[PDB]
Write a protein that binds this DNA or RNA. Structure first.
Length: 425
DNA sequence: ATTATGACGCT
DNA sequence: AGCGTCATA
C-alpha cells in the first residue's frame, strides 16, 4: 500500500472564537480583534486572534495590555464569565452548528471545538459513480491549492499561482498522467469545497481544510494555506514537502518525542527519517512509535477517522495561580460547588440532547510548586446530576490530600471536575 | 500568572 | 485505577 487507499479531510475553523464574536457583533468584522478572558489581570489573556490582528504580531497566550502595544487599534471581545469562571457555552453551541452541517456530507470525527476530521472515501466513490467520465472544471475548486504546484515553466500574485497550479493538476488528471488516488483526492476536494460553502452559507463561519489520504497529511495540508482556503496534498507531493519540513510540524511530534527524534538521530526534517530502518526506529523510540515513524515519513498513516461527533468527557476547571491559591477549607468547598453547578447544567443538557448519562466523576487538583498540570487524580461514582452531591463527593475524595490545618496546605492552584464513562440513556 | 478543555497511551 | 503526553480555543 502507498497509503493512497483513503480520502481524508481536516477542517479547521479560522480563529473560531473570534468569528463567533464577529458574527454576533458586526462592528468587529474585518478588523484586528482578539478574544480574551478575565480583563483584570493585564487586560486578560488572549485565546483567539483574528488574521488582521496576527499581522501586527498579536499571538495567543499574550496579555491584552501587551497586544495593545503591538496593535493599538486592537478590538477585544470578552469570554462570558459565570460563577467566577470562564463560560464557553457560546463557542460550544456554535461548534455544534458547524458539526451538524459537516455531518450531512460524510462521517466526522470531532478533534476539538474548532476542528474535525472527515472520512470522504465512500462519498468520493458515489460522486465518481454518479458523475461518470465527466471532467472536473477549475470552477469547482475556487479556493483549492495543490501543494507543490505550479512547477517548471501572472505568477507574481498569489491567486495567479493558485490557478496555474490547479490547471497543471487538472490537465494531468484530464490527460490521465495522474493516478486514480489523485482523482479521488480531487473529487474529495470538490466535496470539501461544497461542505465549506454550506458551512459559510448556513452559519457565516469561514474555515480552512486539508485534503489527503490520512489524518496527519490532511492536518499538515490544512495549515499550508490560511485563512479560508483548502489545500490538496497528494502522495506524490510528500517527498519534496517532507524534505524541508521540520519534524515538530507533524502531528504528535511537536513535543518530547519529536525532540528526541531530532536529538537522537541528528536530523532536522521529516524526510530524513526514510534513511533509517524500521527496526532502527523501533529500537530508539519503541515498537509502536518506530512503526509509526517509518510509515509516516513515507506519507503513510493508518489511524482511522473515528465515527464520533460528541465529546467523550465533560469537564470544567479553574486555575488559582500564585497568590490566589486556595488556603481555606471553606474556599475549596465553594469553588467545587461552582464547578459542580456548571457541570450539572452541562450534564443535563447533554442528557436531553444526546440521550446519554455519565457514570463517573473525576477530581483533579494541583498544588503550589508543582510543574505538572495535575498533581493528583481521583474518581468517584456519579449517580445523581446534582451539584450539591457532586461537589460534596468531590471534596470527600480529596480531603485526605490536605497536609494540616481548617487551613488547607499546600494551597491549591487548580480544581478540576470531569464527567466520564457515558452510557446510552 | 498562559486559561480551560480535550483525547490518548502507559502501567 | 492513576499518571504523563500532546494539542488548541
Amino acid at each position: 500500500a502507498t497509503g493512497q487507499d483513503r480520502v481524508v479531510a481536516l477542517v479547521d475553523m479560522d480563529c473560531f472564537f473570534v468569528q463567533v464574536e464577529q458574527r454576533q457583533n458586526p462592528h468587529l468584522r474585518n478588523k484586528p480583534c482578539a478574544v480574551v478572558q478575565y480583563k483584570s489581570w493585564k487586560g486578560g489573556g488572549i485565546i483567539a486572534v483574528s488574521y488582521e490582528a496576527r499581522a501586527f504580531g498579536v499571538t495567543r497566550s499574550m496579555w491584552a495590555d501587551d497586544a495593545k502595544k503591538l496593535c493599538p487599534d486592537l478590538l477585544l471581545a470578552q469570554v462570558r464569565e459565570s460563577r467566577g469562571k470562564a463560560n464557553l457555552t457560546k463557542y460550544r453551541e456554535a461548534s455544534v452548528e458547524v458539526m451538524e452541517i459537516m455531518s450531512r456530507f460524510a462521517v466526522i470525527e470531532r478533534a476539538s471545538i474548532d476542528e474535525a476530521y472527515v472520512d470522504l472515501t465512500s462519498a468520493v466513490q458515489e460522486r465518481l459513480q454518479k458523475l461518470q467520465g465527466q471532467p472536473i472544471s477549475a470552477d469547482l475548486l475556487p479556493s483549492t491549492y495543490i501543494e507543490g504546484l505550479p512547477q517548471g515553466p501572472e505568477t507574481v500574485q498569489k491567486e495567479g499561482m493558485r490557478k496555474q497550479g490547479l490547471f497543471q493538476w487538472l490537465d494531468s488528471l484530464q490527460i490521465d498522467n495522474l493516478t486514480s488516488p489523485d482523482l479521488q483526492l480531487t473529487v474529495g476536494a470538490v466535496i470539501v469545497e461544497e461542505m465549506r460553502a454550506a458551512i459559510e452559507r448556513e452559519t457565516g463561519f469561514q474555515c480552512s481544510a486539508g485534503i489527503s489520504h490520512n489524518k496527519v497529511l490532511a492536518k499538515l495540508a490544512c495549515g499550508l494555506n490560511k485563512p479560508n482556503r483548502q489545500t490538496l496534498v497528494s502522495h506524490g507531493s510528500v517527498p519534496q514537502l517532507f524534505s524541508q519540513m521540520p519534524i515538530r510540524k507533524i502531528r504528535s511530534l511537536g513535543g518530547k518525542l519529536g525532540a528526541s527524534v531530532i536529538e537522537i538521530l541528528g536530523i532536522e526534517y521529516m524526510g530524513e527519517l526514510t534513511q533509517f530502518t524500521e527496526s532502527q526506529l523501533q529500537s530508539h523510540f519503541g515498537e509502536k512509535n518506530g512503526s509509526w515513524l517509518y510509515a509516516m515519513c513515507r506519507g503513510i498513516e493508518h489511524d482511522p477517522v473515528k465515527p464520533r461527533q460528541l465529546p467523550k468527557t465533560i469537564g470544567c476547571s479553574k486555575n488559582f495561580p500564585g497568590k490566589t491559591a486556595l488556603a481555606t477549607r471553606e474556599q475549596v468547598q465553594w469553588w467545587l460547588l461552582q464547578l459542580a453547578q456548571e457541570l450539572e447544567e452541562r450534564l443535563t443538557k447533554d442528557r436531553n440532547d444526546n440521550d446519554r448519562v455519565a457514570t463517573q466523576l473525576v477530581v483533579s487538583i494541583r498544588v503550589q510548586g508543582d510543574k505538572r498540570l495535575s498533581s493528583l487524580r481521583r474518581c468517584c461514582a456519579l449517580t445523581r446530576y446534582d451539584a450539591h452531591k457532586m461537589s460534596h463527593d468531590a471534596f470527600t475524595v480529596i480531603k485526605n490530600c490536605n497536609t494540616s490545618g481548617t487551613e488547607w496546605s499546600p494551597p491549591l492552584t487548580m480544581l478540576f471536575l470531569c464527567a466520564t464513562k457515558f452510557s446510552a440513556s
